[PDB]
Amino acid sequence: WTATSGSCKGRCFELQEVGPPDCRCDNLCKSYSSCCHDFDELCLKTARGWECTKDRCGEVRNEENACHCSEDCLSRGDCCTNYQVVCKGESHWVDDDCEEIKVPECPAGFVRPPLIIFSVDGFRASYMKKGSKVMPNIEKLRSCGTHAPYMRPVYPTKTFPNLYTLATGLYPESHGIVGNSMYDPVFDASFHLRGREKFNHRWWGGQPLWITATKQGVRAGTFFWSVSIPHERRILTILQWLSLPDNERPSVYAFYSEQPDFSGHKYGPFGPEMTNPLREIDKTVGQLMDGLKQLRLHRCVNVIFVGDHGMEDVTCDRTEFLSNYLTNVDDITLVPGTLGRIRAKSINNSKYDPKTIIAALTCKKPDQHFKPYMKQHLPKRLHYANNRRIEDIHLLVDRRWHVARKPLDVYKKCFFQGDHGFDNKVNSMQTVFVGYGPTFKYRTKVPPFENIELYNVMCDLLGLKPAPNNGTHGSLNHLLRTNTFRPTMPDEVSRPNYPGIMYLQSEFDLGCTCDDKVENKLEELNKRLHTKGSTKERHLLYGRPAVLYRTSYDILYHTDFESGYSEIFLMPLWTSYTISKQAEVSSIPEHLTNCVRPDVRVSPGFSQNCLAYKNDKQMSYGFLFPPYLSSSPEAKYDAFLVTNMVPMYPAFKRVWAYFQRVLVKKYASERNGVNVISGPIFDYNYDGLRDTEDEIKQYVEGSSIPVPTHYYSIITSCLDFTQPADKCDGPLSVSSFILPHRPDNDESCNSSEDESKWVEELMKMHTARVRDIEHLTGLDFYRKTSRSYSEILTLKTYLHTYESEI
């Protein structure tokens, strides 16, 4: 109940929220059914439309009009946006040539340049080029301001998860809005696009920009607009708020368009009916920019034009049904669509086995247009596991397809031609970014980035200190004319040991054999130097990674590679090596097939042993630096040191071996040498963060040798490929992966064929940013380069997607 007897007289779109049983006059009141009796009458005028005509010029102020063309409208702060154009012979904003905004041109009383977020739903990245002829206002913003060719959304590529990520800089797994539709098992409740449940505070974690702003003394316009407030009223309300007295006026604003998403669903991303929604958006943009020109704020305000996700061709006939795979289909709940989330229909039923579900959904049809995963095996780049609202069973659906439970769910629950929600690296899902204003750069294109990075920038644009988030602060400094923020490298927490030769062969009882006794002052002082680091500036090109946590570890030097060896985890945390274009692949000779040699620099007690692998019938081992790439038959003995050894499922060895024997060499040819850093990752609790020693869930049987959940590699070269990797003068190029360490190759339906048919494809799927690896290892890479730290931060956030041209 709400005693909605009070009035909105002069209170139209008030900024503070008055609580029950009183009536509200803020743009949220319609959603809570708590508006004052007269809200519509007074606060939602429509009469005479939204534009000034030649006959309205210098009229008599009639307060019933939606907007005004009277002489005092400028002062009242409520002219129609084209007022000055029709009446005072002024031109539209779009018609003026853009002049660089070298400094903020702000009216007296304005303490800082305001920020307006213009968000557009379902604005596919390629609309900027393909609709450019019908979007002149947006095209002016783009070309005069700062733009990316596209901006990467978060997964799932849906509205709620993406808007709240924009507002908070957090992955959905962290902010809690993991879908437009969710079931929380603790609440025993469901969150939907419709309904009032979504209005409970308990769903929304993190700290959104408008709370960040309020808590630091900066006032915000609302970020929630009612469906029945037309877009023209939204612009005018923003312009009214900009006319408020200094101490009442917000510094940050939001506008939201349901278009072009709404039509995209009906007509597909490029349906002929899509031209008009794009015209409308532009018109709205024009109105804002004209309005700001009137209030003399158009060279003062920073405007961000941004979308939440793109749009793909999807139709009903492209539906895979679970009923065609499962017999017991009625014992599951499925969150359907462009992604799939499965859980049991009841918990009172413990006969429910996710293992049988995954098995029944795996490579069962040659054409399968989805792939099942346990959430912990989803590509780490999606960061879509660490929340109780994410069901253990996930289906990644092919672009252009849907998953549903039964046929009845699709005809009784074709009316659509577009959808979104797919894997966030899919081209059709990419959306837009443009920044325009004093604080942004002039006529500047920047490389694509992820939307998790904007919260930091919007905090900078507003002199705010960002709440802790998943952006990398400084990675988008190259967008801005002037920077609030100077990023600095984290300090190293653990310094390495540099052990010498300290142990004799006979002190080791590892159960490891090797045929290596086939034995000159020249070539004996020479290999001492190798063990001292005479070739370190060859294999360690960007300085040692910094260990950002307290631990105990050794640096080990060799002819062909350098490693940071953990005495705790009994394996390297990282292994670094360079393969030049010239370098050659050789094989593991017949007498050295099972060679494992004790490392005389590390004690028996801090070594692995061959015995454990012999007892463990599920677990084999591999090497971080690959024998195949030794520079000499003499150097190859180094690769077999117990300290280069890591536990590997025979199934995983297949992936690893092909990477090491074929792909590294291929990459070195194409990129003119590559530097490779590889290592283990332990993330048993799938929070995307490194696990501590006392969080290890899997050991090699009867040992203290922990079993990695993943194996990473970072592959760096010169961006200018005419220069060798080891003599690069300028910017770097990088690609990385985090491969799940799994006992089977069930993920790859073609894995029974030659590795050259499926391995590279699996690696591509599990592509990664260096930054993701940093979170997972507690390491910090690229500490010693000739490049600026801001540029290195951009490099660290880069993701190689392997998608074709946008």
Ligand X SMILES: *[C@@H]1O[C@H](CO)[C@@H](O[C@@H]2O[C@H](CO)[C@@H](O[C@@H]3O[C@H](CO[C@H]4O[C@H](CO)[C@@H](O)[C@H](O[C@H]5O[C@H](CO)[C@@H](O)[C@H](O)[C@@H]5O[C@H]5O[C@H](CO)[C@@H](O)[C@H](O)[C@@H]5O)[C@@H]4O)[C@@H](O)[C@H](O)[C@@H]3O)[C@H](O)[C@H]2NC(C)=O)[C@H](O)[C@H]1NC(C)=O
In angstroms, the first-to-last Cα distance of the chain is 52
Tokens at 527, concatenated: 């290999």
CB half-sphere exposure, 480, CA atoms < 13 A: 21
CB of 618 to Ca ion, least distance (A): 23
Which residue is at the shortest CB distance from Cl ion?
179
Binding flag, residue 205, ligand X (CB under 6 A): yes
Among 113, 161, 206, 286, binds ligand X (CB under 6 A): 206
Buried b (16+ CB within 10 A) or exposed e, 764-779: bbbbbbbbbbbbbbbb
Which neighbouring-strand residues pair with 115? 252, 302
Catalytic residue chosen out of the listed positions 81, 146, 157, 159: 159
List residues near Ca ion by CB under 5 A. 683, 685, 687, 689, 691
CB-CB contact of 117 with 253 (8 Å): yes
Among 8, 29, 166, 759, binds ligand YGB (CB under 6 A): 166
Rg (CA), the chain: 30
Tokens at 91, concatenated: 């031109």
Binding flag, residue 688, ligand X (CB under 6 A): yes
Count of residues of this chain found to bind Cl ion when the rule CB under 5 A is applied:
5
AA identity, residue 227: V
> In which element (H, E) is residue 370 found?
strand 370-374
Binding partner selected for residue 181 from Cl ion, Zn ion, Ca ion, none, CB under the kind-specific 5 to 8 Å limit: Cl ion
CB of 157 to Cl ion, least distance (A): 10
214 tagged catalytic: no
Binding flag, residue 232, Zn ion (CB under 5 A): no
| E strand residue ranges, 580-703 | 620-623, 645-648, 674-681
Measured in residues, the chain has a length of: 806
CA neighbor of 274 nearest in space, from 286, 264, 282? 264
Is 308 annotated in a binding site? The answer is yes
Identity of the residue, 128 or 776, whose beta carbon is nearer to ligand X in the bound complex = 776
CB of 234 to Zn ion, least distance (A): 17
Is 62 annotated in a binding site? The answer is no
Is 184 annotated in a binding site? The answer is no
CB of 793 to Cl ion, least distance (A): 32
CB of 160 to Zn ion, least distance (A): 8
CB of 167 to ligand YGB, least distance (A): 4
Which of the stretches 153-161, 284-292, 312-320, 702-710 binds Zn ion when contact is defined by CB under 5 A?
153-161
CB-CB contact of 332 with 405 (8 Å): yes
Is 516 annotated in a binding site? The answer is no
Tokens at 341, concatenated: 């989330």
Which of the stretches 218-226, 485-493, 614-622, 670-678 binds ligand YGB when contact is defined by CB under 6 A?
218-226
Phi, psi of 476 (to 5 degrees): -110, 25
Which of the stretches 488-496, 511-519, 648-656, 753-761 binds Cl ion when contact is defined by CB under 5 A?
648-656
Among 199, 224, 498, 549, binds ligand YGB (CB under 6 A): 224
Among 141, 775, 778, 796, binds ligand X (CB under 6 A): 775
Identity of the residue, 461 or 655, whose beta carbon is nearer to Cl ion in the bound complex = 655
Binding flag, residue 176, ligand X (CB under 6 A): yes
CB half-sphere exposure, 22, CA atoms < 13 A: 9
As for the chain, the residues directly before each break of C–N over 2.5 Å are 413, 519
Q: Which residues in 261-320 contact Zn ion (CB under 5 A)?
A: 261, 308
CA gap 792, 772 in Å, rounded: 14
Tokens at 422, concatenated: 């797919």
Angle, helices 231-241/275-294, rounded to nearest 10 degrees: 20
What binding mask, one character per residue, do residues 386-425 give for Cl ion by CB under 5 A, x or -? ----------------------------------------
CA gap 51, 717 in Å, rounded: 57
Is 282 annotated in a binding site? The answer is no
CB-CB contact of 620 with 653 (8 Å): yes
Which neighbouring-strand residues pair with 622? 646
Tokens at 342, concatenated: 């499965």
Identity of the residue, 383 or 558, whose beta carbon is nearer to Ca ion in the bound complex = 383
Angle, helices 789-797/770-777, rounded to nearest 10 degrees: 90
Pairing of β 146-147 and β 444-445: parallel
Among 165, 302, 456, 469, binds ligand X (CB under 6 A): 469
CA gap 724, 717 in Å, rounded: 8
Burial of 525 from C-beta contacts in 10 A (0-12 / 13-18 / 19+): exposed
Is 180 annotated in a binding site? The answer is yes
Binding partner selected for residue 139 from ligand YGB, Ca ion, ligand X, none, CB under the kind-specific 5 to 8 Å limit: none
Which of the stretches 217-225, 389-397, 424-432, 597-605 binds ligand YGB when contact is defined by CB under 6 A?
217-225
Among 121, 460, 616, 726, binds Zn ion (CB under 5 A): 121
DSSP letter for 661, please: I
What binding mask, one character per residue, do residues 658-687 give for ligand X by CB under 6 A, x or -? -----------------------------x
CA distances (Å), origin 384, targets 50, 109, 390, 421: 44, 45, 8, 13
Phi, psi of 439 (to 5 degrees): -85, -20
Identity of the residue, 298 or 343, whose beta carbon is nearer to Cl ion in the bound complex = 343
Identity of the residue, 374 or 806, whose beta carbon is nearer to Ca ion in the bound complex = 374
Which of the stretches 144-152, 300-308, 743-751, 783-791 binds Cl ion when contact is defined by CB under 5 A?
743-751
Identity of the residue, 159 or 174, whose beta carbon is nearer to ligand X in the bound complex = 174
CB-CB contact of 283 with 136 (8 Å): no
Extract the annotated binding site for Ca(2+).
683, 685, 687, 689, 691
Q: Residue ranges for the binding site for Zn(2+)?
A: 121, 159, 261, 265, 308-309, 420
* Chain contacts with ligand YGB (rule: CB under 6 A): 117, 119, 121, 159, 163-164, 166-167, 193, 223-225, 254, 256, 258, 261-262
Binding-site ranges for Zn ion (CB under 5 A):
121, 159, 261, 308
Just list the catalytic residues.
159
Binding site for Cl ion (CB under 5 A): 179-181, 651, 745
Pick out the residues of the known binding site for 1-tetradecanoyl-sn-glycerol 3-phosphate: 159, 180, 261, 420
Binding residues: 121, 159, 180, 261, 265, 308-309, 420, 683, 685, 687, 689, 691
